Design a protein around this ligand. Sequence first.
Ligand SMILES: O=C(O)c1ccc(-c2nn(C(=O)c3c(Cl)cccc3C(F)(F)F)c3ccccc23)cc1
Ligand SMILES: CC(C)=CCC[C@@H](C)[C@H]1CC[C@H]2[C@@H]3CC=C4C[C@@H](O)CC[C@]4(C)[C@H]3CC[C@]12C
Length: 241
Amino acid sequence: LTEIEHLVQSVCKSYRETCQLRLEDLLRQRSNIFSREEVTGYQRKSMWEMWERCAHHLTEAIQYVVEFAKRLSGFMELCQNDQIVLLKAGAMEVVLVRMCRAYNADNRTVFFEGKYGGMELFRALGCSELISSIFDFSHSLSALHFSEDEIALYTALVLINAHRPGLQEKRKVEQLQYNLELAFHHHLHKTHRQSILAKLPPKGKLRSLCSQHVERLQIFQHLHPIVVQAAFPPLYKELFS
Ligand SMILES: O=C(O)c1ccc(-c2nn(C(=O)c3c(Cl)cccc3C(F)(F)F)c3ccccc23)cc1
Ligand SMILES: CC(C)=CCC[C@@H](C)[C@H]1CC[C@H]2[C@@H]3CC=C4C[C@@H](O)CC[C@]4(C)[C@H]3CC[C@]12C
């Protein structure tokens, strides 16, 4: 078996071990939808409470993406600067992509605290525009019906991007990126799924949505700080300073 077929297997394994929620569970729970009364309960919570809940869920989701990154071939052999540069730019882009698995395009609901709810669940945050953009992005991804293996390979490429500003060893990230691009393209060809390539988000789209998202989280963090046990302190200290 080729280096490339082994790379496909390694990335798909890493994803399976760090996917946080099982696709099977997410699909089964689609019928489990918040009642009008439960939605009203969430809308009546203080911004501060909804922020504490959402901030903690987002931090947990980031930590699954850090673990995913640490299991990708070559990631740990990059200099720490480059690990931080990739995860700082990339980890929340991966969370936003991972969301499409927990999103039902039929009723525009997301899996949140054990049931599916629409974007009005989050009314107390005062972020309707930004949250609507996040729901829209998941909506556009859901049309692809990504396989588990496609999302493993795609989210590896979201992270391993030699064009991120600030890399010391751009050559080394280029080498890992070329191999992951070949693995993704190789797997799509083998599974007759090259049709998704033209349907993938235009680039800049994920970067600019993620930029806006993180900007808002940094404002909330500045006004009402949460603390977590840092999975990757050098990275954590670059956002939670
Ligand atoms: O456990 C850790 O080591 C760790 C855990 C999380 C991050 C990380 N948080 N983050 C946020 O945007 C964030 C979140 Cl999710 C919750 C509350 C406040 C914030 C904010 F202050 F940064 F804005 C990120 C964005 C992009 C990339 C990595 C991260 C980094 C490291
Ligand atoms: C802008 C702002 C202040 C808040 C954003 C509100 C809202 C859009 C956030 C809060 C919790 C997030 C989920 C948390 C965990 C997961 C699991 C992951 O495996 C996939 C992603 C997912 C489902 C997150 C999706 C985005 C959520 C709902």
